[PDB]
Structure formats: structure tokens, C-alpha cells
Amino acid sequence: CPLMVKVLDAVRGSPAINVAVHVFRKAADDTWEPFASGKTSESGELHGLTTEEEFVEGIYKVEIDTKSYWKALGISPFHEHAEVVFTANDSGPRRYTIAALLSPYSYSTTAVVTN
Amino acid sequence: CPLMVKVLDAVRGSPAINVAVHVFRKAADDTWEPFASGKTSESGELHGLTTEEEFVEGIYKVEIDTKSYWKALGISPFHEHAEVVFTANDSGPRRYTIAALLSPYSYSTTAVVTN
Amino acid sequence: CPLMVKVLDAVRGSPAINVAVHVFRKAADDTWEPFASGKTSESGELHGLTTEEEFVEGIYKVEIDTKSYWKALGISPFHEHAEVVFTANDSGPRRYTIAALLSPYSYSTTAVVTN
Amino acid sequence: CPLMVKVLDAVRGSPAINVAVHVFRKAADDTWEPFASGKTSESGELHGLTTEEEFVEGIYKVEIDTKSYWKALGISPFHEHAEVVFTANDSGPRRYTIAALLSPYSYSTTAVVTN
């Protein structure tokens, strides 16, 4: 599992459950091609997005659908999504965890890169 | 200015100077139409992006492009490119400050909304 | 002011107003000796804590006490109390801005050091 | 394991390895009593600090010795430590993870509280 997303909720002090995540890959013509998607589990984690074979070198965009998440919990948030763009596997294959910490008017996204 | 953007370097503890900022507004036909752009000043702030007249209700995107900033200072590499997407002015005109805190493998962003 | 403290509410996207701030300086005999204190203004900032004359080299601690702020507005509960410890002026006098971003189960702090 | 600490390094995009952590508990006389300590492992995690029996209701302080960490890696950081104070188990026993994200001039500490 070379690409994983983990989401925490700073209001509840909990994993962020059932948050939708959409991943895109930049195509040769500089448009965004859909690459993978899913929703976080009870642990706030989303596994199984891709395989080592398909997760080739490139520029990737991870979008975390935070607005829908907060609204469902009764909170009006600021952002539509949390988003981060990064280049992956340009020094060879690595495992990436995108760790997101969410508040209604703020977030952080961190890439934890191993192997 | 109803929209201000501030960029900070979390490695050096400094304003990030001469960082390119691009703002977009979402059209019907879900395409991001260019809205404003500029570069951060000595204080890491970018003022005068727009006016109250033109900054109407909508979904906006702020992209922080750091390449020229880190090349010039000679510093490493912020692999995480920030894109901050939000609805503005849906409850009336407000003053928005969008702050971005940059690290090589992370960024944080906060919105302060006044008035 | 060579030391400024700024407090933001990450749930509301607002300055945290009337937050009590206590600053200490570390003595020989590892005891924190009181140095300065005040409450944040409308802008969430606290200016005039000290002067360049008195703000000499040392280890300082900034404690952000939020109890009165959240009781008055009636808001939930920031269970994480912030304590920010740092050496100041060891490379000559600088201007320090200590920012704290508060959530119920998290906080973030950043230092911007100029001159 | 009711109290765990996990530390990430935003410069390296990695777990923060061999970071010292000191935990204190507020005594009846309002002084800080040493409670537990240890160092993070290769995963950036520190387990085994305490037991459910000994981790009673109270006010706890977690200190993460970040200065020593950064200096060892060749980076001059701003803070002496990252520190967070919180009340634990006042609604009954819970499991706490203190998730810390570190940059040289900024950090965040989040309490993830389960059970």
C-alpha cells in the first residue's frame, strides 16, 4: 500500500470517519486525471487506494472533502476541501502517508514518506 | 483589502518573500476562472488582490507557488504545494486573511474572517 | 514591542479576544520567574509586554490561559493548554511574534523572528 | 496502553526518532510531579509510558524535547520543547494519543482521545 491517507478531527479529538478523498494525477497534457478515491474508516484511515505498479512517478493531487464532513457533524466550516499537490516517486518508489489535521477554519497536510 | 494572503516559512521563522500567489473563482461549468494574482512582500503579505466591488459571493481557490522563493534563497524544498479552496461572501462581505505556513513536507493554512 | 503574542480561534476563524497571557523567564535555580502578562485585544494580539531594555537573552515561557475567553462567549473547550518555551535574543535582539492557533483538542504555535 | 505519544518531522517527512518525552502530573499542592518518560522509537511512537491503574484522573503535562532533536540533525530550532497541558480521565478512563507535528519554528500538538 504505497499511498495512504489519515485524517484527524481537532474539534472532537478523534479520527475523522467517513471523509471522502479524491486523488488525481497530472497527465502529459497538464490536466488532472482521476487516479483514486475512497472514504476513511473508523480509524480515520484510508487504505487500498492504489498499487505499487500503478503508482508511478508523477504529480499527484489529494483532495479531502472536509466541508461535507463538518456539515454532517453540525459545524459550518471555512474550506470546501483540504488539498495538497506533490511529486511522488521521482527518486524511486516510496510509501506515502498524507496525514491531515482538521479544524473548521484551519488544516494541515503532512507527507510522511518511507522506504 | 477584503482578501489578504500571508505566507510564512516554518523552517526559518520568517515571512516567505516574493512567493507567487494565484487566485481563481469557480465558474458555472466547474472551471476555475482566473481572478487575481501577485507576489508576497517583505512582510510575507500580499495586499490589493481585489476590491469589495469585484469580490462577490463565490467559490475561490488560492494557490501558493513557492519555486522562485526557494531557488533564490537557495533553500530546500517544500514538496507540498498549497491550494486553499473556500466559499467567500455567502453571508455578506467579510475581510478574509488566508495564511499559509510552509515546511518541506507539510503545510498548514488558517482563515481569519472579520466583520 | 520586541515580543508580540497573537491568539486565533480555529473553530470560529476569529481572533481570540481577552485571552490571558503570562510570560516567564528562567532563573538560575531552574525556576520560572514572572516576566510579563496581559490580555489579548480585539485583534487577538497583545502588544507592550516588554521593552528592548528588559527583554534580554534568556529562556522564556508563554502560557496562554483561555478559560475566561471561552466562558464569556459560551463556547466549548479547548482542553489543550498551550505553553511555548524558547530562548530569545541569544544572537542579538530580534522582534518575536508568537502565534497560537486554538482548537478544542489541538493547538499550533508558530514563531516569526525578524531583524 | 492509555497514554501514547507520536511525533512527526515536517522537514524530513518522517517519523521523529529518539525524541525524549517527559510527562508530569499536577500534585495536590499544585506542583508538577514527574509521572513518566521515554523516547520515541523508529516509528516515531512512544508506548508503555503508564498503566490504566496508575493513569488516574488529573492534570498532565507532556513535554517533547524538540530542541535536542533538531540540533542532532543539524538544525537550529526556535523552541526548547513542545509542551501541552491537559486534563485526563475526568469523564472516566480514556486512551490518549498526543500526536505532535514538528517544524523548526512551529509545532502542533493534538490529543486523540478514544474509548
Domain ranges of chain C: 1-115
CA–chain centroid gap for B92, Å, is 21
State the Cα–Cα distance between residues C81 and C64, nearest whole angstrom.
Answer: 7
Question: Which residues lie below 8 Å from residue A31, measured CB to CB, with a gap of 6+?
Answer: none
DSSP structural state of residue A88: E
Question: Which residues lie below 8 Å from residue A109, measured CB to CB, with a gap of 6+?
Answer: A62, A64, A82, A83, A84, A98, A99, A100, B80, B106, B107
Q: Is D61 exposed, middle or buried (0-12, 13-18, 19+ CB in 10 A)?
A: middle
Residues of A in contact with D8 (CB under 8 A): 99, 110, 112
Q: Give me Rg for the CA atoms of chain C.
A: 14
Chains that touch A (3 or more CB pairs under 8 A): B, C, D
Q: Which three cell numbers mark D56?
A: 488516574
Q: What φ, ψ does residue A89 adopt, rounded to 5°? A: 65, 25
State the Cα–Cα distance between residues A88 and A60, nearest whole angstrom.
Answer: 7
State the Cα–Cα distance between residues A67 and B33, nearest whole angstrom.
Answer: 22
State the Cα–Cα distance between residues B96 and B94, nearest whole angstrom.
Answer: 6
Q: Could you give the dihedral angle defined by the CA atoms of residues C73, C76, C77 and C82, in that order, rounded to the nearest 10 degrees?
A: -50
Inter-chain CB proximity B14 and C101 less than 8 Å: no
Beta bridge partners of A36: A23
State the Cα–Cα distance between residues A53 and C68, nearest whole angstrom.
Answer: 55
Inter-chain CB proximity C106 and A105 less than 8 Å: no
Q: Is D59 exposed, middle or buried (0-12, 13-18, 19+ CB in 10 A)?
A: middle
Q: Which three cell numbers mark D94?
A: 480514556
Please count the other Cβ atoms lying within 10 Å of the Cβ belonging to residue C56.
Answer: 11
State the Cα–Cα distance between residues A56 and A58, nearest whole angstrom.
Answer: 6
CA–chain centroid gap for C68, Å, is 16
Nearest residue to B103 (alpha-carbon basis) of D78, A101, D103: D103
Nearest to A101 among D110, D113, D114 (CB): D110
State the Cα–Cα distance between residues B110 and C42, nearest whole angstrom.
Answer: 18
Q: Which three cell numbers mark A89?
A: 516517486
Residues of C in contact with B45 (CB under 8 A): none
| Cα atoms found within 13 Å of the Cα of residue D110, Cβ hemisphere only | 26
Q: Which of D24, D60, D83, D91 to mutate to test the interface with C (most CBs of C within 10 A)?
A: D83
State the Cα–Cα distance between residues D33 and D23, nearest whole angstrom.
Answer: 9
Q: Is D79 helix (H, G, I), strand (E, B) or coil?
A: strand
| Cα atoms found within 13 Å of the Cα of residue A16, Cβ hemisphere only | 29
Give resolution in angstroms: 1.7
CB pairs under 8 A between A and C: 40
State the Cα–Cα distance between residues A60 and C42, nearest whole angstrom.
Answer: 41
State the Cα–Cα distance between residues C93 and D42, nearest whole angstrom.
Answer: 38
Smallest CA–CA distance, residue A98 to chain D, in Å, is 10
Q: Is B73 helix (H, G, I), strand (E, B) or coil?
A: helix
Residues of D in contact with C30 (CB under 8 A): none
Q: Is D17 helix (H, G, I), strand (E, B) or coil?
A: coil
List, as residue ranges, the binding site of C. Answer: 6, 45, 108
- Is the separation of the CB atoms in C58 and C73 below 8 Å? no
Q: What φ, ψ does residue D7 adopt, rounded to 5°? A: -130, 130
A107 to chain C: closest CA residue: C10
Q: Which of C31, C103, C110 to mutate to test the interface with D (most CBs of D within 10 A)?
A: C110
Question: Given this structure, which CATH class describes domain D1-115?
Answer: mainly beta
B101 to chain D: closest CA residue: D106
State the Cα–Cα distance between residues A31 and C55, nearest whole angstrom.
Answer: 53
Inter-chain CB proximity A104 and C79 less than 8 Å: no
State the Cα–Cα distance between residues C63 and A54, nearest whole angstrom.
Answer: 49
- Is the separation of the CB atoms in A115 and D11 below 8 Å? no
- Is the separation of the CB atoms in D61 and D32 below 8 Å? yes
Residues of A in contact with B84 (CB under 8 A): 79, 83
Give the residue before each break in chain D, using a C-to-N cut-off of over 2.5 angstroms; say none if it is continuous.
none
Inter-chain CB proximity C8 and B101 less than 8 Å: no
State the Cα–Cα distance between residues B81 and B93, nearest whole angstrom.
Answer: 28
State the Cα–Cα distance between residues D46 and B73, nearest whole angstrom.
Answer: 37
- Helix ranges (H only) for D4-112 are 66-72
Beta bridge partners of C7: C100
Residue written as grid cell 458555472: B28
